[PDB]
């Protein structure tokens, strides 16, 4: 609040304008980064009420209705595990909207595979989508269909191990 200090500071020119401009550029850049990463879909997709995906369990990654924040158990664990003229500007996208974007991406990739990323979302059963992915890596569809229960059990076990590993590693 010193007037004399500001009067002496004016002799140095537009340094303060440069610093404010650079900080403003960084602040808008962070919001641009968040838009680029998360806002890649213009449709907010939602999962069907009945979670019949041919044995595949997505409860640990889909949003929990019981939680007020509408986050997944994995996302909730992630948020729990992260802990003089200065001001902190809030992010343009809040945590619930970012969670909503992730939920839309999850719903699109579960119900429509990769179709929603290239155009209109085309529905496909999840085992058939997994079979398409199997064909992508050079494994025939029959292997997926014959061993569907084993693949679903392995996927569920791996997702559970992911949650345990995140909860158990500092």
């Amino acid at each position: 609040d010193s007037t004399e200090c500001s009067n002496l500071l004016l002799q140095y020119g537009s340094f303060c304008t440069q610093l404010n401009r650079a900080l403003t550029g960084i602040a808008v850049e962070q919001d641009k980064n968040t838009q680029e990463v998360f806002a890649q879909v213009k449709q907010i997709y939602k999962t069907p009420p009945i979670k019949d995906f041919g044995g595949f369990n997505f409860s640990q990654i889909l949003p929990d209705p019981s939680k007020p924040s509408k986050r997944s158990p994995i996302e909730d664990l992630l948020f729990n595990k992260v802990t003089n003229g200065l001001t902190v500007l809030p992010p343009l996208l809040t945590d619930e909207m970012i969670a909503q974007y992730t939920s839309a991406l999850l719903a699109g990739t579960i119900t429509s595979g990769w179709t929603f990323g290239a155009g209109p979302a085309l529905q496909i059963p999840f085992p058939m989508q997994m079979a398409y992915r199997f064909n992508g890596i050079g494994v025939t569809q029959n292997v997926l269909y014959e061993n569907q229960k084993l693949i679903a059990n392995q996927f569920n076990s791996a997702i559970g191990k992911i949650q345990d590993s995140l909860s158990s590693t500092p």
């Binding site: 806002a39 907010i44 939602k46 069907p48 019949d52 179709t115 209109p120 529905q123 496909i124």
Partner: protein, 50 residues
């Protein structure tokens, strides 16, 4: 206002239904990428001292 992320689109998922396209659109989109800047040189002696 509170911003809207996107229009809601509930995909009609079921265990035995698929959606197959009957048509296509040839879409051309633009992507602008900067490559170079203006090449500026500053004579340090002449700038500071003339």
């Amino acid at each position: 206002y509170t911003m809207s992320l996107g229009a809601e689109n509930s995909v009609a998922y079921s265990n035995n239904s698929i959606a197959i396209p009957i048509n296509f659109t040839i879409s051309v989109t633009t992507e602008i990428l900067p490559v170079s800047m203006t090449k500026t040189s500053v004579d340090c002696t002449m700038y500071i001292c003339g």
